Design a protein around this ligand. Structure first.
Ligand SMILES: C[C@@H]1C[C@H]2O[C@@H]2/C=C\C=C\C(=O)Cc2c(Cl)c(O)cc(O)c2C(=O)O1
Length: 211
């Protein structure tokens, strides 16, 4: 259940963090982009697999702030990841060129698709809960010094998809405020082909479409 990151990933995390230290709000853009890509994947799979969406009929991205618990959640109903894929996609990585280029960054991060790691700019801990059609629900967690993957004792709660949960750093508290999040979500979801919602307040509470 316990794993060490590949050397290349450790180097990558430091590069990403040291480069975007002055543009931290970009992590949200990357998580939303990853979510969109995951949704494109299942949409493609559904063209050839009629039962592809049986675990969850919607294709959405839902974001909610848990201020009390100091958590930010970004959930998509994309293709999801099996246990082996969580370990492979998040723990390992022409990567040498990218790194060479990085060390020698915002646009490059998005192009190589390693924007996930920018979450460490605002979080002391990142948790990834995922359910893929070929596996049971699992949880990946990391403080960046190592990571672990365990079967989710809550069972299959996602249906299908992935939830990125960020335990925000003391100084990243602003990202728990609806205004801030709504504002950022609207900016980075403008060109996403899937509907993105934010659990917001009007005091009654409900999902609010951002794009
Ligand atoms: C493996 C699948 C689909 C991939 O093609 C998509 C693009 C980027 C993937 C990056 C990852 O490492 C996992 C991941 C992250 Cl980090 C995320 O924030 C949201 C997600 O939905 C996925 C995912 O489930 O990704």
């Amino acid at each position: 259940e316990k794993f060490a990151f590949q050397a290349e990933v450790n180097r990558m995390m430091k590069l990403i963090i040291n480069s975007l230290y002055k543009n931290k709000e970009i992590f949200l853009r990357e998580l939303i982009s990853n979510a969109s890509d995951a949704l494109d994947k299942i949409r493609l799979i559904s063209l050839t697999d009629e039962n592809a969406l049986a675990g969850n009929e919607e294709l959405t991205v839902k974001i909610k702030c848990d201020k009390e618990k100091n958590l930010l959640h970004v959930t998509d109903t994309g293709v999801g990841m099996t246990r082996e894929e969580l370990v492979k996609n998040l723990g390992t990585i022409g990567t040498s060129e990218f790194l060479n280029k990085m060390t020698e960054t915002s646009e490059l991060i998005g192009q190589f698709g390693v924007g996930f790691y920018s979450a460490f700019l605002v979080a002391d801990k990142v948790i990834v809960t995922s359910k893929h059609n070929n596996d049971t629900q699992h949880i990946w967690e990391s403080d960046s010094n190592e990571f672990s993957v365990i079967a989710d004792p809550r069972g299959n709660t996602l249906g299908r998809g992935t939830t990125i949960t960020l335990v925000l750093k003391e100084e990243a508290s602003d990202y728990l405020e609806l205004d801030t999040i709504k504002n950022l979500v609207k900016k980075y979801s403008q060109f996403i082909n899937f509907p993105i919602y934010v659990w917001s307040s009007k005091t009654v509470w409900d999902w609010e479409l951002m794009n």
